[model samples]
Target: GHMPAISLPDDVRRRLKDLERDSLTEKECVKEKLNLLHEFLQTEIKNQLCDLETKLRKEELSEEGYLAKVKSLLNKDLSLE
Candidate 1:
């Protein structure tokens, strides 16, 4: 006999392990080069994307801390919309 971890939100944990936000669906815009006007949240979303990518892919931004920490970071920093 075994005691199955007596839990429910286990699905949530498993989901945390298995599930992920549409980081890539969100990624679509990042790859699209957000250097235009009024890209406030657009810029920030790409920032977070780069931050996460840096944390995951590389931060202090090995990619954008270099690039995103680049030209058009003039809207928001961490001030979300």
Candidate 2:
């Protein structure tokens, strides 16, 4: 069965294609993909999370507000599990 297309940002999508074309064994390819994905999420996703944490710590946002904001950014099923 064909997998559904995922919504990725254009730059990330391009990089993902590049990763797919790299000269690596199947396992290495899988590992590379995971490594890149992890780095990308660490910077792109966790940066926002850290900012939110800062806001919460500073009492600028309440815990409820933080949770709601996080949920909103993650957008339910769209979030990385």
Candidate 3:
């Protein structure tokens, strides 16, 4: 029903787009942006849920195998969360 994702400042966007930095730094930067970005905008999470499911069926083309594979990892990650 909607389009794409949220917006952050230009520097974060520029770094994520152009600059290649340390892996953890990259994660921290993007995570901080999304942390704030997602604070009030919960629909972004819901969008990923819906769109990712669609991709599993539409583009991923193997919902069964895909979810089956993802289930273990996601389950592991979510298990204690």
Candidate 4:
């Protein structure tokens, strides 16, 4: 059985060819960009969370009270389990 070829747009194909010619450097650049983006997003979220947590503590929010505060700051239902 033969698999049919898929087509890409000319610009995309050209970019792919360029990447193929500089595969190692292109891979490193993509990894670096992804890491930088992740770090930027993480820091932004952490700072916002910490600022709100500080205010909550200053306003005498109880340990239980902080749950909603943390949840609202976290927004998404993230699970590490």
For TM-score, the strongest prediction is 2
lDDT, model 2: 0.61
Q: Best lDDT goes to which candidate?
A: 2
Model 3 per-residue lDDT tens digits across residues 1-81: 155443456765676565445344633544454454554445655465466567766776465554454345433433333
Clash count per candidate: 1, 0, 0, 0
- The list of candidate 2 runs beyond 4 A from truth reads 1-4, 7-42, 76-81
Each candidate structure's TM-score, on Cα atoms with residue i matched to residue i, is 0.22, 0.44, 0.26, 0.32
Please say which candidate is ahead in TM-score: 3 or 4. Answer: 4
Model 1, range 16-51, lDDT digits (tens) per residue? 443345333333443433432223234545655465
lDDT for each residue of candidate 2 in 1-81, tens digit (9 for 90 to 100):
156555556887787677667755644643454445554454566566778779878999987787567656655435543
Ranking by lDDT: 2, 4, 3, 1
lDDT of 4 by residue, 8-80 (tens): 3476546656766765453364444334333424566566556766867699676556555555444341221
Give the better candidate number (1 or 4) by TM-score. 4
RMSD of each candidate? 14.8, 11.3, 12.2, 14.5
Question: Which stretches in model 4 have alpha-carbon errors above 4 Å?
Answer: 1-41, 77-81
- Which parts of model 3 have CA positions greater than 4 angstroms off? 1-24, 46-81
For candidate 1, the 10 contiguous residues with the lowest summed lDDT are 72-81
What's the CA error at residue 61 for candidate 3, in Å? 14
Q: Relative to the true structure, how large is the alpha-carbon lDDT of every model?
A: 0.41, 0.61, 0.50, 0.50
